[PDB]
RNA sequence: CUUGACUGCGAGACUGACACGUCGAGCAGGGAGGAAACUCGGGCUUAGUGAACCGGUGGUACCGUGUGGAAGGGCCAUCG
RNA sequence: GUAGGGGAGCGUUCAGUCCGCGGAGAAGCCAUACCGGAAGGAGUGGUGGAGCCGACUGAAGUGCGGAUGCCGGCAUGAGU
RNA sequence: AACCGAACCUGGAGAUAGCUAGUUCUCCCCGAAAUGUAUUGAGGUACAGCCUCGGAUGUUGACCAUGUCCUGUAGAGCAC
RNA sequence: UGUUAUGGCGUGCCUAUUGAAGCAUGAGCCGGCGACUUAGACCUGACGUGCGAGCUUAAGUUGAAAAACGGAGGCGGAGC
RNA sequence: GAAACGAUGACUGAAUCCGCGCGGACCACCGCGCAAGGCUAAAUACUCCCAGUGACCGAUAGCGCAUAGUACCGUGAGGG
RNA sequence: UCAGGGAACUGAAACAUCUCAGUACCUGAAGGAGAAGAAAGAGAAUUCGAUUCCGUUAGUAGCGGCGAGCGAACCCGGAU
């Protein structure tokens, strides 16, 4: 049979070198792809959200683990 | 002279004739020509399904009498029970209430039906009296 | 045609499903909504002269317990 | 329309419309506690445009 | 949240002297006799809640 | 070991035509675990669902048609 | 440049003013090589025989190729 | 009473008609849409999206370059 | 200006359409009739006018070649 | 519907002035009223008809009719 | 004008309550007019004081598959 191409959404909401706010949603993910770095929290759905205001740090280690951080802009 | 009498200069435009216009055939091609049924509201679209009750009452309502109004201008004619109609509260239908908005020190004595806290706390600190029905 | 006043003059007929309830039902709802009629009985009496005519059961009671413009 | 008065179509002082949150009202609950307090204040101004017209003259 | 003949249940809730409705989903399967928990009523909060009824 | 499968709230964002939906630092009443930093407003996440309306049920005391009460209604839960 | 929106206007009946024209002849009808960016508007010539332009303002039953549209008149099929 | 799966006439009555057909005087300025979602919805309708006029704002637009990150297609490869 | 001979060019109009010279609808021809209106102390907006933190009257009364009176009431003025 | 009150169709069927009906379930206070008997211009409605006027028509308009419900159609109602 | 009787198409984008609407039609009685009337009342001031009519209250109180929709009265201003 066939049914349901699903809407979902996902993607990475706030990209690198972008200035965010406290409360903005940075990444919408499913599992843990992007680990919350310094300045960054992770919701129960593993959504990455911002604790404080500042600039978006992307950290690439070879993946498997990589990090969304927030460093101050000021 | 009536014949030299001019127009309003831009009060009205002429009306709208849909006869002629060489390629006007009006309204919408199908569907929504000819009907008297158009009707923007209705229970169909997102009004019902909307979840409220509360309950309707709207009881006693009072004349809002600005403090700024009372003070500043006029004489302090000692408003009281009659002259007040000429003071532009004009309602009838309802009793009168006094609330605090503008600030100027004045001795004033007024008969209204009720007042707010900082209203009486205002009128007296500048000196005066505010009466209430017994 | 009765004695005092008149006859017939009738009402419509209502009937309702979800009949009863818990008095505090969900609601009562309707079905019938049709027109209806009314009538009475006739017996033989006379006044001023011998007649038969018709007798309203109320006025039957009345004529029986007293002679107000009529006798049996 | 004249039904919608006590239900919230309600109009503000800025000529906006009060429509908040329906998420679950009476039947079907037993999820969380603040979805239950999820009942809000709120609105949108898209369908507020023709909303007031239901309530129009009686503010 | 649908209901019928089935197992488990949605059982109502109350406190010692305090008046509050938790209404949580219970289950008669493994064990249900004591519905006893600790929940917080009108004012005092801080009480044991017997949801057994 | 326990009843955070909490109450009163939401800075700010994801998403949707709308209605819904989603995540969420943090303030307070307060709790539970830990020596402590601290964590907790259900569950690795993603499905396990349904607007309004009419009604059943517990709580609160606003409306209640001359006035004082009650009937009925309203609001906070909540069941269908 | 199609639905659609915006702007300027042309022409027609009625009405109030204004200016007037007409038996040495009104409107209407007929022709016409002129005028105007268009709707349109004049010039003269022929018909007519009792009335009518121009200007301003206002009001409309106000503009037709269609609707197997309506009333009428007259064609084609045919000297069949 | 010359068309009877319910006669004829007058009437309610301009029945309703998400259907079809038609909708006339000029020029000027712009200028679409047949997508998305919901719909006893599918040739219909509500909201959005795209058109126009007016106001406010006042380069935020547009392309192109530099910087910065995100993506797993083409290719490829055989490490599951 | 009228008529003409020759050359070049040249797929009625409308409607309905993804698409019409269409072998898809309509229509014999010419008159004349013929379709976005009217109403309400309604709702909302644009332009214009009078007063302006005020603004207005309705029924009705009285004069009526002519219009005045009539503040019952309505709308601003406070919100949640 | 918590449904008061008027109104009757069927069964019932009280008081009478330290009395009776009402005041929107019902109770008490507190008010308002006194049913079972009748008549009663005026201000209101309409236009067969007569008068006067009209930004009403003027011979496909205006009433159907510049007189005709006649001719003409139908058994008739009716149409015209 | 009052009275006895009383539709449906239609709206609810389907349809039973509902709306159309006590509308159309039938019938009965009467006049130039009718109807209605001299509070067992409105009404919440211990005000008003027969009926009808206009304004207004007011789309307000309220009615309702609380859907489509329907929609008062007192006060107050009058004609009388
Ligand atoms: Mg068409
Ligand atoms: Mg021959
Ligand atoms: Mg032949
Ligand atoms: Mg032959
Ligand atoms: Mg036959
Ligand atoms: Mg028709
Ligand atoms: Mg055409
Ligand atoms: Mg097209
Ligand atoms: Mg053809
Ligand atoms: Mg051909």
């Amino acid at each position: 049979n066939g049914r349901d191409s699903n809407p979902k959404y996902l993607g990475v909401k706030k990209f690198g070198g972008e200035v965010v706010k406290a409360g903005n949603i940075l990444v919408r993910q499913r599992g843990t792809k992007f680990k919350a770095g310094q300045g960054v929290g992770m919701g129960r759905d593993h959504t990455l959200f911002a604790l404080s205001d500042g600039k978006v740090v992307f950290i690439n280690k070879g993946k498997g683990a990589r990090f969304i951080s927030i460093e101050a802009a000021q | 002279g009536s014949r030299k009498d001019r127009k309003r200069v831009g009060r009205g435009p002429g009306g709208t004739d849909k006869t002629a216009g060489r390629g006007h055939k009006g309204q919408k091609s199908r569907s929504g020509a000819g009907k008297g049924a158009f009707f923007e509201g209705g229970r169909s679209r997102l009004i019902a399904r909307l979840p409220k009750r509360g309950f309707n009452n709207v009881g006693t309502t009072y004349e809002v009498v600005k403090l700024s109004q009372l003070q500043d201008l006029e004489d302090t004619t000692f408003d009281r029970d009659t002259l007040e109609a000429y003071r532009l509260v004009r309602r009838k239908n309802r009793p009168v209430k006094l609330l605090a908005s503008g600030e100027i020190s004045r001795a004033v004595t007024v008969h209204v039906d009720a007042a707010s806290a900082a209203a009486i706390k205002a009128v007296e600190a500048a000196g005066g009296r505010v009466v209430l029905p017994e | 045609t009765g004695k005092k006043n008149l006859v017939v003059n009738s009402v419509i007929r209502r009937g309702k499903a979800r009949a009863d309830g818990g008095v505090g039902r969900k609601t009562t709802g309707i079905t019938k909504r049709v027109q209806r009629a009314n009538l009475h009985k006739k017996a033989i009496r006379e006044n001023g002269q011998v007649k038969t005519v018709w007798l309203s059961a109320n006025a039957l009671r009345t004529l029986s317990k007293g002679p107000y413009k009529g006798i049996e | 329309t004249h039904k919608m008065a006590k239900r919230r179509i309600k109009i503000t002082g800025t000529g906006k419309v009060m429509a908040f949150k329906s998420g679950k009202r009476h039947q079907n609950t037993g999820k969380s506690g603040d979805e239950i307090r999820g009942k809000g204040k709120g609105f949108v101004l898209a369908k507020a445009e023709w909303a007031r017209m239901k309530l129009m003259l009686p503010r | 949240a649908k209901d019928g003949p089935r197992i488990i249940v949605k059982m109502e809730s109350s406190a010692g002297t305090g008046f509050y409705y938790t209404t949580t989903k219970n289950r008669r399967n493994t064990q249900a006799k004591l519905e006893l928990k600790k929940y917080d009523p009108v004012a005092k909060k801080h009480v044991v809640f017997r949801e057994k009824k």
Side-chain angles (χ1 to χ4, degrees):
Chain A
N1 300 326
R3 73 273 215 122
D4 212 309
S5 62
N6 260 309
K8 24 270 187 197
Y9 268 133
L10 307 191
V12 178
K13 297 311 175 185
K14 309 262 85 280
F15 282 151
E18 291 201 41
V19 179
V20 295
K21 206 174 190 185
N24 292 34
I25 308 264
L26 299 100
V27 186
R28 277 283 189 175
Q29 41 153 63
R30 274 336 211 61
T32 291
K33 170 51 223 69
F34 289 154
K35 293 84 175 296
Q38 216 287 289
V40 177
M42 169 182 314
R44 66 119 110 184
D45 94 275
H46 313 179
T47 288
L48 298 179
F49 62 104
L51 284 349
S52 49
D53 319 44
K55 205 194 73 181
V56 169
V57 185
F58 254 98
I59 300 180
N60 203 122
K61 280 212 173 289
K63 305 190 178 185
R66 278 200 289 148
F67 298 87
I68 280 266
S69 282
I70 293 183
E71 77 166 35
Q74 315 307 321
Chain B
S2 301
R3 75 102 159 103
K4 190 69 179 176
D5 207 14
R6 308 176 298 104
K7 60 189 59 205
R8 259 268 101 263
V9 201
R11 159 236 50 189
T16 36
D17 281 349
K18 331 298 208 299
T19 71
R22 42 66 194 106
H24 282 107
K25 318 179 283 165
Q27 284 156 320
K28 159 179 188 44
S29 250
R30 298 298 165 89
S31 87
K35 322 174 179 189
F38 309 147
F39 227 163
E40 252 280 7
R43 87 95 179 63
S44 196
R45 301 139 263 148
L46 272 149
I47 310 178
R49 104 189 280 226
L50 228 78
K52 188 78 126 283
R53 269 139 82 172
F55 74 106
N56 171 246
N57 201 80
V58 198
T60 320
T61 314
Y62 290 79
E63 287 70 294
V64 185
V65 180
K66 196 180 183 190
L67 206 70
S68 113
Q69 186 187 154
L70 221 177
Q71 276 163 353
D72 198 292
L73 280 173
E74 215 213 347
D75 291 23
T76 297
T77 325
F78 338 117
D79 326 309
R80 294 160 190 171
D81 64 327
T82 302
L83 326 174
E84 36 182 14
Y86 243 180
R87 300 192 296 93
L88 300 66
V89 296
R90 52 181 163 188
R91 285 303 314 167
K92 316 175 179 180
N93 200 190
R94 292 163 188 173
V96 197
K97 176 126 70 167
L98 187 70
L99 323 178
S101 300
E103 313 163 11
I104 150 181
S105 188
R106 204 170 190 179
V108 284
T109 291
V110 205
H111 304 355
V112 310
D113 297 283
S116 45
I120 45 181
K121 196 80 161 184
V123 167
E124 296 171 347
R129 199 183 195 100
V130 165
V131 117
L132 313 164
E134 299 162 324
Chain C
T1 149
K3 190 271 161 186
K4 193 188 187 75
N5 297 332
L6 239 84
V7 296
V8 295
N9 284 319
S10 307
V11 306
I12 95 171
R13 206 69 169 243
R14 170 255 248 262
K16 9 148 284 173
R18 296 160 160 180
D20 276 85
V23 194
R25 343 108 292 269
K26 291 310 159 190
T27 212
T28 252
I30 331 197
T31 36
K32 294 183 185 178
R33 296 302 295 207
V34 304
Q35 265 69 347
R36 212 99 291 179
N38 283 318
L39 272 155
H40 345 274
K41 189 174 303 284
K42 74 158 155 306
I44 298 175
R45 313 295 182 273
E46 56 88 14
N47 213 70
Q49 66 186 8
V50 176
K51 286 183 171 185
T52 69
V53 298
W54 288 55
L55 253 77
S56 335
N58 294 335
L60 174 53
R61 293 162 48 107
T62 286
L63 274 140
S64 61
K65 314 312 167 190
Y68 279 115
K69 292 153 189 177
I71 208 180
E72 315 308 273
Chain D
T1 150
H2 196 285
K3 168 56 222 169
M4 312 333 172
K6 335 88 197 187
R7 183 190 296 174
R8 61 164 172 270
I9 197 85
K10 272 307 160 187
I11 296 192
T12 191
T14 335
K16 314 172 300 177
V17 170
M18 283 286 193
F20 318 153
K21 202 263 192 179
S22 53
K24 295 162 318 174
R25 204 178 81 111
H26 20 288
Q27 29 94 22
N28 271 75
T29 191
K31 236 70 57 168
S32 88
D34 262 271
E35 194 202 16
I36 308 173
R37 286 292 153 142
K39 301 299 301 177
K41 305 236 69 64
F43 61 102
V44 285
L45 285 168
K47 62 209 276 203
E49 190 161 335
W50 330 250
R52 10 198 182 183
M53 310 193 68
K54 277 307 96 197
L55 189 81
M56 181 73 222
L57 223 41
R59 301 156 75 176
Chain E
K2 188 185 57 186
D3 273 65
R6 57 174 73 197
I7 74 289
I8 81 183
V9 59
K10 293 75 186 171
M11 283 305 263
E12 289 87 37
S13 305
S14 35
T17 314
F19 337 88
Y20 168 118
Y21 266 153
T22 319
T23 308
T24 206
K25 168 107 103 175
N26 315 0
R27 28 210 62 259
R28 309 177 296 189
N29 56 72
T30 46
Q31 276 190 183
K33 250 73 184 180
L34 290 174
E35 325 249 301
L36 280 181
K37 297 160 90 175
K38 186 272 173 185
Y39 272 76
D40 18 322
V42 237
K44 168 81 178 178
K45 319 309 290 172
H46 195 5
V47 328
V48 167
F49 257 73
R50 167 145 67 195
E51 293 176 321
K52 196 173 183 175
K53 31 76 56 198

